[PDB]
Amino acid sequence: AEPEHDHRKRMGLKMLLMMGLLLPLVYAMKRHKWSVLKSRKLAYRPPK
């Protein structure tokens, strides 16, 4: 029914291991760029 079964799962491990690397790293990249905004301070200084 499924000759691909063994290859599918070897690929499956390789995916999860890569995603375990790539997901935190891309997250750290998005956190880096978004830092500028997430730590921004506003002040309102109207006349009088």
Binding site: L37, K38, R40, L42, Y44, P46
Partner: protein, 106 residues
């Protein structure tokens, strides 16, 4: 005159105000209004002081919404202190449109 029923009517209004939660972001009621044509005209008519206060309040709220944070409880807008600053501008804009619409009928 009116005492006991009024405070309960006010109580449901105050309850809903807190559950609405725009006050956690420092928004007034009139800051949250959907900008149709009537509303955009009302903004345009606002005096300098009120216009600029409105923008700062939106900015501070969008900033909080981005960080998924809210103000400290001290700094939430109190239902009693909520200024309906747009309403009389908006009411007049609506009154003006409705007169044009009556003239267009005849």
């Amino acid at each position: 005159a009116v005492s006991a029923s009024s405070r309960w009517l006010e109580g449901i209004r105050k309850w809903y105000y807190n559950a609405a939660g725009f006050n956690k972001l420092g928004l007034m009621r009139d800051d949250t209004i959907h900008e149709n044509d009537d509303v955009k005209e009302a903004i345009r008519r606002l005096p300098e002081n009120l216009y600029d206060d409105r923008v700062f309040r939106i900015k501070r709220a969008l900033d909080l919404s981005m960080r998924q944070q809210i103000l400290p409880k001290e700094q939430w807008t109190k239902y009693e202190e909520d200024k309906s600053y747009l309403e009389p501008y908006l009411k007049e804009v609506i009154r003006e449109r409705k007169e044009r619409e009556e003239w267009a009928k005849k």
